[PDB]
Write an enzyme that holds these catalytic residues in place. Structure first.
Site, mmCIF file in Angstrom:
data_model
loop_
_atom_site.group_PDB
_atom_site.id
_atom_site.type_symbol
_atom_site.label_atom_id
_atom_site.label_comp_id
_atom_site.label_asym_id
_atom_site.label_seq_id
_atom_site.Cartn_x
_atom_site.Cartn_y
_atom_site.Cartn_z
ATOM 1 N N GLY A 126 -8.707 -1.549 -23.302
ATOM 2 C CA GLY A 126 -8.764 -2.780 -22.529
ATOM 3 C C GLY A 126 -7.422 -3.480 -22.450
ATOM 4 O O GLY A 126 -7.145 -4.208 -21.495
ATOM 5 N N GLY A 324 7.933 10.745 11.518
ATOM 6 C CA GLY A 324 6.881 9.927 10.948
ATOM 7 C C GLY A 324 7.397 8.968 9.892
ATOM 8 O O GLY A 324 6.904 7.848 9.780
ATOM 9 N N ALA A 325 8.387 9.407 9.114
ATOM 10 C CA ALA A 325 8.996 8.550 8.099
ATOM 11 C C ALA A 325 9.646 7.324 8.747
ATOM 12 O O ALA A 325 9.521 6.199 8.245
ATOM 13 C CB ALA A 325 10.000 9.325 7.278
#
Ligand SMILES: C[C@@H](Oc1ccc(Oc2cnc3cc(Cl)ccc3n2)cc1)C(=O)O
Ligand SMILES: C[C@@H](Oc1ccc(Oc2cnc3cc(Cl)ccc3n2)cc1)C(=O)O
Lengths: 424, 426
Positions: A126, A324-325
């Site tokens: 946790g 695309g980059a």
């Protein structure tokens, strides 16, 4: 006093004499308090490594939740100091539940008040997930979990120091100052290699953009090294910087760099922090093996982050940006505030040689093998004279302005200042 | 090239004779049209694989963007049919800018109208990233995505792909309403589907299908990615619901990086479109990558906490056999504001198994014990630990479980809690 003493730890973090406990000291494993960090009202809590090694229990978690409610109500930054083996096994499900309520408080605070974690001791279970929900995690070396830690300090003291600076970055963002931007202008182009094929470290360029004697607080320096991100100041004002780093993987995007960039974009957008996006990226890559799943999923998330961004975000193309980059690195199609390019910058679908190999595949194939390499180079040269330049992109409109690299700072500052706090 | 004709493909998808083109037909590489899908007004566009392999250019991308604007304006679902090798390279940066605008439109629509992709052919570059931005991707086998969890549904063939595409818009756009009479009529003893031994693994899918309507398909997403987690859409007494369920048959049902990621995205999707959730919990722990990289499970796990924590659609949890430790908190626990938490009578809700618990809490007494007696001691220590910890009765007392239920009323109890919750809050 034991070095793990929570009041000692709180006192080293907060401004001298500013500490005000939010509850009576007890054996809960948590001490929470109010104080100031360079003047700004701040809430903090410290796990108590002296009681059950800091293990998280019902009463302890309750103090944390109260501290979060207090911080949220006053809109104060909240800082957690962590040293804890995790949940108290003996307290059973009750402790699990109480730990969960800490998570839920952090989730309620997410994007609303800044949350900084300073991990100064072992932090597991946790106590690993707690910091993972906050905005920036500073770790002391005395504390694989790749990508979780944002900043590695020199030791505990230096960790509180960086923690304190982060409170300032988020809570004293300040205003742009046009006169200071110009005063800091240099020829940043000189930091590039003479050859356009040679790789370089982008960080001196980032440093040259940011204020001279101000730290660049880089995030996750050792994870996804083809992307550089982090906080700094530009003419006094907090900005976040993202920059392809040609030194690693040729500066290509991939799954982890896209993830690193996307998370950073969302963090800055959440807190009104404007972005400078330094672009020099030839393409993108799969993982080991040829897995494209990550870069597709993470890449999509990067698109989403820029697409939905409302803070000012200005792009500077230094050398080359392909395909695309190019689109993902804060392009005009994704509503970039402004896009600048250095004079010799290239903006294109791909390299001219590769472009030509596709566009003239049949002519090249039909040509005699001895005349062919010459034909390819000749076609590339003529392709390169009409496609790829800044002036072409200017004409199309995907670059707003070509700039003298000696005016990078002032130009960037001017564009960021002219944009609204929120739109685009 | 007839079979890849966009009008034909659009016609094969829409209700017969409902196609109304949104623009003059051309050679742009896309055709967009309005129509109906079982009466629901739907917008669709098809890349044109008969023109330069469906390569995406300025004019074609423009049609997609206008289609998006129409759908967004009328709040209609929008369906893309994809067959494209990439961008029209001869258009240069112009084409890049145009494809980006497609992405930007999909981003504007995100969470506002449902977006469904049907990939019927090779889809590469920009045509790979487009579908990645939509909500559900259906893939025909006679195809390939290129530039793994990107494809949500694998169809039998192209026509089957349209059929699932169509069912999906029904799930999103004709969500229906809960119906107590139907819920109860479908009740069975779902507990009987578990093995006799609580240590045996089993496929959770028959439990999910037992909960959902008997003559309604369970549209599982990403069946072959992150197989310790099952997610998908189906109908519960006629009402569209989302289901998440740990699958003990794979990795003991443990959470890990990609299972957390799979679950988190699915939660955000249902939350976006007002689709209530059934969370079937049987999870003993969580795992790192086999190289002991915990980074993914931490980053992705925190994303799951966030997804449940912010969720406002109704979401009900059923603990069947066990829920332990940190995995317990993440699986729609009371602490993350679960709408209601049910448990079967023999279920265990605990920090860890009693044997493991005692082994830690009493490591010294155990190690001190004589070797032929240390086993009997471990077992008597465990039995007394579970007299006091781990049971449903204790969990009811604490408040992390709201109701212990007869497994024979599982389906109708879940329906009741989802039906009576506020449509938004929690
Ligand atoms: C030439 C090339 O054109 C493309 C290729 C890809 C493309 O879309 C994206 C979207 N997001 C991306 C995100 C990242 Cl991190 C990297 C690359 C990305 N590419 C858009 C156009 C092609 O079609 O062959
Ligand atoms: C006993 C054990 O208690 C824990 C362990 C972990 C924990 O926090 C989370 C949060 N998100 C999680 C998400 C996933 Cl997908 C898995 C596990 C997760 N665990 C909370 C309590 C411990 O402290 O050692």
């Amino acid at each position: 006093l034991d070095p793990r003493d929570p009041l000692l730890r709180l006192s080293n973090f907060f401004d001298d004499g500013s500490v005000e406990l939010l509850h009576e000291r007890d054996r809960s494993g948590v001490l929470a308090a109010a104080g100031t960090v360079n003047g700004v009202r701040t809430i903090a809590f410290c796990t108590d490594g002296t009681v059950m090694g800091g293990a998280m229990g019902v009463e302890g978690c309750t103090h944390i939740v109260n501290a979060y409610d207090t911080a949220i109500e006053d809109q104060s930054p909240i800082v957690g100091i962590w040293h804890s083996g995790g949940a108290r096994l003996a307290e059973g499900v009750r402790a699990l539940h109480a730990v969960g309520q800490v998570f839920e408080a952090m989730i309620r605070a997410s994007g609303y008040i800044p949350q900084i974690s300073v991990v100064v001791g072992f932090a597991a279970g946790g106590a690993a997930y707690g910091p993972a929900l906050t905005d920036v995690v500073v770790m002391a070396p005395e504390s694989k979990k790749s990508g979780v830690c944002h900043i590695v300090a020199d030791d505990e003291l230096d960790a509180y120091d960086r923690g304190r600076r982060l409170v300032g970055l988020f809570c004293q963002q300040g205003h742009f100052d046009r006169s200071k931007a110009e005063a800091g202008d240099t020829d940043i182009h000189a930091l590039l290699p003479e050859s356009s094929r040679r790789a370089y470290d982008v960080r001196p360029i980032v440093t040259a953009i940011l204020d001279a004697d101000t730290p660049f607080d880089e995030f996750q320096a050792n994870w996804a090294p083809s992307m550089v991100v982090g906080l700094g100041r530009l003419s006094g004002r907090t900005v976040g910087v993202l920059a392809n780093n040609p030194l690693r993987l040729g500066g290509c995007l991939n799954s982890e760099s896209a993830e690193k960039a996307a998370r950073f974009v969302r963090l800055c957008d959440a807190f009104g922090i404007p972005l400078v996006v330094v672009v020099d990226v030839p393409g993108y890559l799969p993982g080991v093996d040829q897995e494209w799943g990550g870069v597709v999923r993470r890449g999509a998330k990067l698109l989403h982050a820029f697409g939905e961004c409302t803070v000012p975000r200005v792009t500077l193309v230094t050398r080359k940006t392909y395909g695309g980059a190019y689109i993902a690195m804060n392009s005009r199609s994704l509503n970039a505030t402004k896009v600048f390019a250095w004079p010799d910058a290239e903006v294109a679908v791909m390299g001219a040689k590769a472009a030509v190999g596709i566009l003239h595949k049949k002519k090249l194939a039909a040509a005699p093998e001895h005349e062919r390499e010459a034909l390819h180079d000749q076609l590339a040269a003529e392709h390169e004279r009409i496609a790829g330049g800044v002036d072409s992109a200017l004409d199309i409109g995907v670059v707003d302005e070509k700039i003298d690299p000696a005016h990078t700072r002032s130009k960037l500052t001017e564009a960021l200042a002219q944009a609204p706090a929120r739109r685009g």
